[PDB]
């Protein structure tokens, strides 16, 4: 209305910018989607449609972010890329003799990755119960019920993969 608003630094405007990781199974590479409304500019590497493409799993990549609405210095964003989605398998560990009263689900690490495992979190939702662990086991379940158990894997609190398992408390 009056005086033109002071432009912030791009490092100021995008200091807390978030990213979503989208795996391409064909290329075995990740795309980082920048969670911003405006069409941002990236130096040197391109970020067409606010996406940084062809990122190798478990490797840090840096992207300098700017826009006309903000001044220098650029926001230097470190992309801590997660492990490949095909390196994890959701396995049903339920013992067949106890299938009527138990659920056992476990994520299996089917191939090695260099990312630190301390930043890897596994979450499960069976019914409406939420678990945080690589493996979950429920016992004393009432027979003849059906549950949709949803699970996701986070890297630095970033969901990069997920899967579902429908389990019945019976023998077949
Ligand atoms: C990304 O990878 C794909 C598949 O390997 C390739 O066709 C493309 O040229 C790469 N480069 C960019 C910037 O998308
Ligand atoms: C990768 O990025 C994270 C976050 O910035 C950092 O803490 C870590 O030191 C980096 N890894 C290496 C090998 O420098
Ligand atoms: C490890 O991962 C957590 C997320 O679970 C992250 O917040 C933290 O910065 C990381 N710590 C180290 C020492 O790499
Ligand atoms: C997996 O993630 C997608 C979004 O990436 C979401 O639409 C879906 O509901 C998720 N849940 C499961 C368990 O597949
Ligand atoms: Hg399996
Ligand atoms: Hg493989």
Swiss-Prot record:
It is found in: Cell membrane; Membrane raft; Synapse. Glycans are attached at residues 16, 44, 54, 60, 68, 119, 162. Isoform 1: Detected in thymocytes. Isoform 2: Detected in thymocytes. Isoform 3: Detected in thymocytes. Isoform 4: Not detected in thymocytes. Isoform 5: Detected in thymocytes. Isoform 6: Not detected in thymocytes. Isoform 7: Detected in thymocytes. Isoform 8: Not detected in thymocytes. Heavily N- and O-glycosylated. It comes from the Eukaryota. Belongs to the protein-tyrosine phosphatase family. Receptor class 1/6 subfamily. The first PTPase domain interacts with SKAP1. Protein tyrosine-protein phosphatase required for T-cell activation through the antigen receptor. Acts as a positive regulator of T-cell coactivation upon binding to DPP4. The first PTPase domain has enzymatic activity, while the second one seems to affect the substrate specificity of the first one. Upon T-cell activation, recruits and dephosphorylates SKAP1 and FYN. Dephosphorylates LYN, and thereby modulates LYN activity. It is linked to Multiple sclerosis: A multifactorial, inflammatory, demyelinating disease of the central nervous system. Sclerotic lesions are characterized by perivascular infiltration of monocytes and lymphocytes and appear as indurated areas in pathologic specimens (sclerosis in plaques). The pathological mechanism is regarded as an autoimmune attack of the myelin sheath, mediated by both cellular and humoral immunity. Clinical manifestations include visual loss, extra-ocular movement disorders, paresthesias, loss of sensation, weakness, dysarthria, spasticity, ataxia and bladder dysfunction. Binds GANAB and PRKCSH. Interacts with SKAP1. Interacts with DPP4; the interaction is enhanced in an interleukin-12-dependent manner in activated lymphocytes. Interacts with CD53; this interaction stabilizes PTPRC on the membrane and is required for optimal phosphatase activity. (Microbial infection) Interacts with human cytomegalovirus protein UL11; the interaction is required for binding of UL11 to T-cells. This is Receptor-type tyrosine-protein phosphatase C. The lineage of its organism: Eukaryota, Metazoa, Chordata, Craniata, Vertebrata. The chain holds residues 225 to 390 of 1306 of the full protein.
